[PDB]
Symmetry: D3
Subunit: 240 residues, 6 copies
Amino acid sequence: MKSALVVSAHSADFVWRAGGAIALHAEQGYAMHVVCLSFGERGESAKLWRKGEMTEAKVKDARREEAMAAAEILGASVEFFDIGDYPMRADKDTLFRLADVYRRVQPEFVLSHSLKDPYNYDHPLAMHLAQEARIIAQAEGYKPGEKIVGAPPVYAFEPHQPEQCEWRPDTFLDITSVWDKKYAAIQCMAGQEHLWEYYTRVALQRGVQAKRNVGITSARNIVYAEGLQSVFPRVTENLA
Amino acid sequence: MKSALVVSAHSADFVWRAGGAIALHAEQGYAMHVVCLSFGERGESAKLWRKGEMTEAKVKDARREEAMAAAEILGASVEFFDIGDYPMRADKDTLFRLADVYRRVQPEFVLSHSLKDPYNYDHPLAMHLAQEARIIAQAEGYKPGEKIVGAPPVYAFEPHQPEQCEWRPDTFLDITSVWDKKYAAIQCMAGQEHLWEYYTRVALQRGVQAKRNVGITSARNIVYAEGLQSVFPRVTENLA
Amino acid sequence: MKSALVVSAHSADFVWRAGGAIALHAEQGYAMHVVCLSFGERGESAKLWRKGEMTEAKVKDARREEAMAAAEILGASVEFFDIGDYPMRADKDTLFRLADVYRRVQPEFVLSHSLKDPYNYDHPLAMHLAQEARIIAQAEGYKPGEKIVGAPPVYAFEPHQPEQCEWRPDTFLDITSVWDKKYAAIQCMAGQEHLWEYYTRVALQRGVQAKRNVGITSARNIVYAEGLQSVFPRVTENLA
Amino acid sequence: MKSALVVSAHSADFVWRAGGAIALHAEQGYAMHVVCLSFGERGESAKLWRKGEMTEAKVKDARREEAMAAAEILGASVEFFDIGDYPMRADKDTLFRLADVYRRVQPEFVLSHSLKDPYNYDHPLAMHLAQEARIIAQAEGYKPGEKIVGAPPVYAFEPHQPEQCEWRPDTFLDITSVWDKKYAAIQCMAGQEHLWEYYTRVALQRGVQAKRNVGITSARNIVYAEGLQSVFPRVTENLA
Amino acid sequence: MKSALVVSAHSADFVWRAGGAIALHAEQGYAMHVVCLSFGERGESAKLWRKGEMTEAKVKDARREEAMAAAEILGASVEFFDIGDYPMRADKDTLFRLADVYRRVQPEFVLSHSLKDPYNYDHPLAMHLAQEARIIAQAEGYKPGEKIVGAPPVYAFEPHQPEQCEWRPDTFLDITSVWDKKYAAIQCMAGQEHLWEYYTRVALQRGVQAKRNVGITSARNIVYAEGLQSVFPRVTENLA
Amino acid sequence: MKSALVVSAHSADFVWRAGGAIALHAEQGYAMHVVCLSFGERGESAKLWRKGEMTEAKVKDARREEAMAAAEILGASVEFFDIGDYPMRADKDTLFRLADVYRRVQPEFVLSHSLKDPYNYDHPLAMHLAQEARIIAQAEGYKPGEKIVGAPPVYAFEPHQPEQCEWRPDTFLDITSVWDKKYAAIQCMAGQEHLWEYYTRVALQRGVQAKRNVGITSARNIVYAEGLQSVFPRVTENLA
Ligand SMILES: [Zn+2]
Ligand SMILES: [Zn+2]
Ligand SMILES: [Zn+2]
Ligand SMILES: [Zn+2]
Ligand SMILES: [Zn+2]
Ligand SMILES: [Zn+2]
């Protein structure tokens, strides 16, 4: 089956930043798989920590259930490496774990975080894991005999503060046809209504910009979009 | 009819740098049109100037005939603004001339030079003309009532010294199926065999790199490629 | 009196991009002055051109009245160089005209466009005029005997597509206290409701980002902000 | 009390690069705290190693006494993590140590090294520690119940070879009023007279440049300055 | 004796990327030394892994023999750290191992990989090791009493995809006089004829570009060149 | 004879920024030629404008005499295009004038201003003239029959605020042996003692940095240096 991979540093990230891309490609017949490296239990769970008698285990449970609910709505499978956030740290074993996901999923493309992020050190680490694991999975000397990975395009989805991250979308994905799914997944992020609104505005802004880049008087109905920054040059037979 | 536009600073440039793209899209049913802003009569015609009793008029004639022969082979139409090279200079009238080409051709995409070039000031000027004329042609206040231009992608094709020009190909066009046409067009560039060889090596190098970026063990037969740098973000519904 | 200057390529630009900054500093006792180099009569007036029997003179009249109405609401004075858009072109005389505005206004700071803009060549030209005129006005050899200009900070306000323009806000101006004025000025931009909504979303997005950069749990009520990119290093006695 | 933090890779760095900023803010009522991650015992102590029978313990003692003397003169407190230089290496525990300093000091701003430095790998590591520890200290899941850190601005002070480090000062701090203190602290750096002279020239050069950026004919008496590069966008209500 | 150092991530890299530089300086009386950090046994040995009953030990043996044969042809000595590729990882001990090579060889210059490489994470690690070990070897506190290293220039030799690596050659080394040696060394890379051809084309392309940068009508016979990117500013008494 | 060229936007610039390079190469047997495009009569002559009854003609006379005196001391010839400063503007004729200087001088290298300068628009214009005129002079179609120019290296000498200009010295010229000449030339810049001191400090700072880049314990006596940024890749047979 056609497949693709999302590598999310914290469990909520794939929902804010990749929900549209996931739902859209699922409807195109893709087996979308999400790896959440951590749950954002320490640094992306303020509401929970403000309740009494909170624990990391309790936070992880709440985050896990939200992610599974969102994944179901979007049409993706999801797994949890649970390696911890703030700080997130990985070793060779994390890397090989992720390379094995690549070997199993054989994704056509990969979505992860920007390589710079002055607001969150965990985010670029996730993308570095995603990229290096991809290359390990290409090596005929890694678990010899296994089917190797090819060269799936890798993209950074939109960070919270794109210019501060030196991130530029060179690719707009029109997610207008699946906005309802992305927003329903967004609503699984309990207690984070301000972010619901923020990422709604993001999709609308990128929607207008995407429309501008196909011609402002075009009849195409581009209302919601996700911006992506490509890691690799694309290969094509047509320049339109 | 489907159409596209190449803006060449000097008459030979579209052959070295865009021959593949022209021949490839022509076979896809595109009316490919080339504008040569000048003939490279002063700065790209050393062999001719080394003959006796040479004149700019004589050089232009030789360059014009070569370009027309190459265009015929590639399957493009070509016109000559004849505004002079070394130095190439343009005014509002040049700009409007080019905007009118846009309005007539209604291209789906545009190819021109890199925006930096420490070896040739004429080259970025050509691309600035191409880009600004494109925007003029978008304006409903420019020749009101005429059909406006949309937002065709613009690409810089490969300069002679790409790294010195700070140029990076983010797009590889597989021109393997039309290499014979590009090379036959190249052979119209009389007396420039060293450049024939140089741009053959360029296509082979980009071919290997393009192949690497689809997976080195892929069965795709990518032997010759042209590298392009995109000016604008592309809009799509699929990330593969 | 304390004063400051906005240099707008087209008459509507200072409203979308600087309305907050204008209204905010006016309330601080600044004589805010706006120069509109053109009216955007050819490239920023599509609605008007779609009416019958439209002329540039008629478009300019409509644009002029809108700008004057917006300026009144924001608390700024405004003048119109009327040098034409799409393409906007300037000569030494335009430059000296603007240098004379500097000499008269003696602004404490200047707002204008980003220095790159792949969607609009007029915009960077406006900022280059603003910057060079500022330097001319510094010269004791320019109209000797006149009081020279000092070194007012210069900022680029937010372009429509900030990342494509390689623009990063290094400064957020909290305009929460004057949002009603900016929005009322925005409503003077007749027939452009989609842009009303776009720049409302911009202010809300920058508002959230500005809040993030003072501490997400801070009691400061930062709801609407404008992002600016500084041209020059600032000089201070305190780093908080 | 108002407070601020300096993170110095080696014990002498805060004296050369931040002495002015420390003395200046101390006089403004700031409790200035300095963390020296190491003493520069192996790579910034050549004079000592040229004496006979030298040891790292002896070097550290000499460096510690100098730093304490300088801190006293500048009006700062100082602590020593003693994690070793050339190479400096940190782990999660170093990170948490520093996050605890943040939680205790609650600094209004942070000064540390440039993020690139081809002459000293320890320097960017110090700044990465400073930045990541700051973010850990923001997390309500890190030592839950403790008062979290907000968003204090972070600045890179001037490296020895600023252009090679790709460092640009976007902020000049006028330290004219405390130059005598900075220079007295500098003189605690025993045997390093060439560096005394170098960083005197640095302050004078930045002084002239800062003066240029407030207007060369301004009456402001800016003689000595420190240049800083900001990590985050600042938030303000005034653009002068 | 005059000496210089090449730090190669995988055993084959110094042959493709530095063979010319090695052979050329050897003929100038340099003791050229190569450190191969790994053999590229897992990620640069596909042909071998496609044979039956292959092992990492067997791959390393084959790679070692090739490297020794190439080194002999080029006129260099070579040693093998054998720390493993895909992923290559280093610790303080690797670093000190390399610093000791510096102390022993006292190289006049160093060649290693580009600092970015989206196709191979091992490559920048090698260059970071090379650079940091160089600085450790400068420290009078590292193995006190030993002769320290000065400031040998460091260069990144050409990566497979230079623009994707953001690599620009600021230095061309004319290797025309030793091309036969480089190519004979290249032929030791058994079964990799496509790469023989690729790096032949690279040398020819850089040859043409180097010739262009000394004057296209110069009598200098520059046919084969290697491109290098310098890490540090060079110091000279002549600007020709 | 060996020769080289300096293109100075204003008459004083070659003294502050290139005096060392001029004196040093003159002693190596170079015929050093300086073109001053203007006298800096309007924007670099404040002291004169503060006297009574000043005129541009009077300022130009004073500037001309200073430049001629400095040139004599440094060992260069100098000519004055007198095209005006603040604003400096050039046309095709200026360009051809400069190309003719190239054809006559046949320089081995060229020194001019940085390509960015937010403090002075005239400076980059001078460098653009220098670069484009160089290329015109290469063209066998420009004044056919004349001896063409080859590919002399072009360098930007140090601007007043290097980091704000995004300028990095990749080349340090040791001018220790001619500092007395540069300083004597500097003293011809009547009434500008603050700049005498500034550019003395610049040379001392670059001197220390150049020394650092040959090894801090080297016996080389590098006290005064000029920093240069190269436009083109250099071609060499040795990497030390
Ligand atoms: Zn996250
Ligand atoms: Zn050309
Ligand atoms: Zn506009
Ligand atoms: Zn240090
Ligand atoms: Zn390798
Ligand atoms: Zn000047």
